[PDB]
Structure 1
Amino acid sequence: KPPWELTEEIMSVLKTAFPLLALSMETMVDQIQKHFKCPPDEDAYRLIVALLNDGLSYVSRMPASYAKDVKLPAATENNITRFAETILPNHIRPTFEADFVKVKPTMYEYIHNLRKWRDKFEEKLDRRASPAPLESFAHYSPHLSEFRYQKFDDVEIPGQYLQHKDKNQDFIRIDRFLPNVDLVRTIGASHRRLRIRGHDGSVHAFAVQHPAARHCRREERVLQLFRQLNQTLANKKESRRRDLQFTLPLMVPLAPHIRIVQEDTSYITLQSVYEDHCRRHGMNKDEPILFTMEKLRGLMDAKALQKPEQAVTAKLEVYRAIQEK
């Protein structure tokens, strides 16, 4: 029979036993899925950053397009107009259309406008009042008022069955959802932070990622493999004495697009460090990439040979100049 027939059979068998537990878990998942979706201000930022990165990558792959005469090749105008039409809110559609669709610009102005829009949206996002009440994401508060007033059969904190243990006697159970939700902005996206209190006082933080990537299963498989490998390190003498382990968070998919990831509340990326330094020292964060693109355009417009095999000394000179400047 088709796979989905067997899947439905197993699901019905599971529902037959433990009806109340299944009901509680279903309601919890439904609430989380429904009330934790991206607002338009973040979708616009995500899509703008994606388009900018794609354009920069294309220009890097095929230099000499950065000149002030190439007219937006690769049929990207279809993507631009589709985004302006069906993936933008009514408020900002006119300005975006006037800036991008009407002018029909070259690569230079395309990138300039995208950078300006990205900076504006970043500044807009970073000024939000961060800790929002957990009752805002509701119509009658089914996440704060629920759960010890509306649960049935003592749901458990997700993600505990991925670990290498020997019995589930002492697993932690959800007891309460903390009333504050943090708003976090990453380089290319943003998410909302959830907190749960266990039955023995512990507090656990999860990050709800609404637009899950297109390669989640592969990442989860890699994490599974290395979590399996961690046992040998934990048992071997030369690695246990130095405390050598891989850092692998727990991800639990709720729906094929939503997901929750165990979160550390003090992370920072390398790009964030770089941008903070640039802001402090009054520089521009995008200068090196523009400099590289312009210099490569200039030096590839002319002869692109006379160097030994491929280590074009122009590339090394540009690298050294960037490092020095």
Structure 2
Amino acid sequence: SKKENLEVLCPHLSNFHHQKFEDIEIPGQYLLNKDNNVHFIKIARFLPTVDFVRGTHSSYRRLMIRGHDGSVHSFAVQYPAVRHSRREERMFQLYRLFNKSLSKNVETRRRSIQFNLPIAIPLSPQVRIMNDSVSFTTL
């Protein structure tokens, strides 16, 4: 089944927004260096019917999160995340640090050049969540 229910899989996250009593933010908004803090998107609720995605060499589950501004953010749960994730995320951090030099130069700003890194935020040192929309493919 390509679409499995969240309240069957994890009933705490389908019941989250009732027993939540503060403003949690969407994780991974501090990695993208957006100067202030007031316009960050707060998690409204977890959507039901999460997706089971079979890849080429593995498979994972994609859970969707409704934001407080009406937007839906999809994340991929890599449950056996391989232990070279810290080197990956440090390269992601390094190449996201260069995106501000690539917007003050006029020639890279006319052509709208940015580096487009993925936002992967680790939860435990076994599981990380990565941003993953549908209509992402590999070659």
The TM-score range, normalised by the shorter chain, is over 0.9
Which residue of 1 is the match for residue 45 of structure 2? Answer: 176
Correspondence list, 1:274-289, <5 A: none
* Number of matched pairs: 139
Which residue of 1 is the match for residue 62 of structure 2? Answer: 193
Separation of aligned partners in 2, 1:162 and 1:247: 13
Which amino acid in structure 2 is aligned with residue 144 of structure 1?
S
Which residue of 1 is the match for residue 16 of structure 2? Answer: 146
* Residue 146 (structure 1) shift: 2.2
Which residue of 2 is the match for residue 131 of structure 1? Answer: 3
* Residue 232 (structure 1) shift: 0.9
Which residue of 2 is the match for residue 207 of structure 1? Answer: 76
Correspondence list, 1:22-41, <5 A: none
- Relative to its length, the structure with more strand (as a share) is 2
* Residue 196 (structure 1) shift: 0.5
* Residue 219 (structure 1) shift: 0.5
* Residue 165 (structure 1) shift: 2.1
Separation of aligned partners in 1, 2:39 and 2:31: 15
**Does the 8 Å CA contact 2:50/2:63 hold for their aligned counterparts?**
yes
- Relative to its length, the structure with more helix (as a share) is 1
Structure 2 residue 119 is the aligned partner of structure 1 residue 269: no
Which amino acid in structure 1 is aligned with residue 72 of structure 2?
V
**Does the 8 Å CA contact 2:16/2:46 hold for their aligned counterparts?**
no
* Residue 176 (structure 1) shift: 0.9
* Residue 241 (structure 1) shift: 0.7
SS in 2 for 1:136: helix
Which residue of 1 is the match for residue 124 of structure 2? Answer: 255
Structure whose CA Rg is larger: 1
Which residue of 1 is the match for residue 24 of structure 2? Answer: 155
Separation of aligned partners in 1, 2:110 and 2:16: 46
**Does the 8 Å CA contact 2:43/2:65 hold for their aligned counterparts?**
yes
**Does the 8 Å CA contact 2:5/2:49 hold for their aligned counterparts?**
yes
Runs of 4+ in 1 over 6 A off after TM superposition: none
SS in 2 for 1:239: helix
SS in 1 for 2:41: coil
Separation of aligned partners in 1, 2:25 and 2:33: 17
Q: Where in structure 2 are there 5+ consecutive unaligned residues?
A: none
- RMSD of equivalent CA atoms: 1.0
* Residue 205 (structure 1) shift: 0.5
Per chain length, whose mean CA-contact separation is higher, i.e. which structure has more relative contact order (CA < 8 Å, sep 6+)? Answer: 2
* Residue 152 (structure 1) shift: 2.2
Q: Percent identity?
A: 53
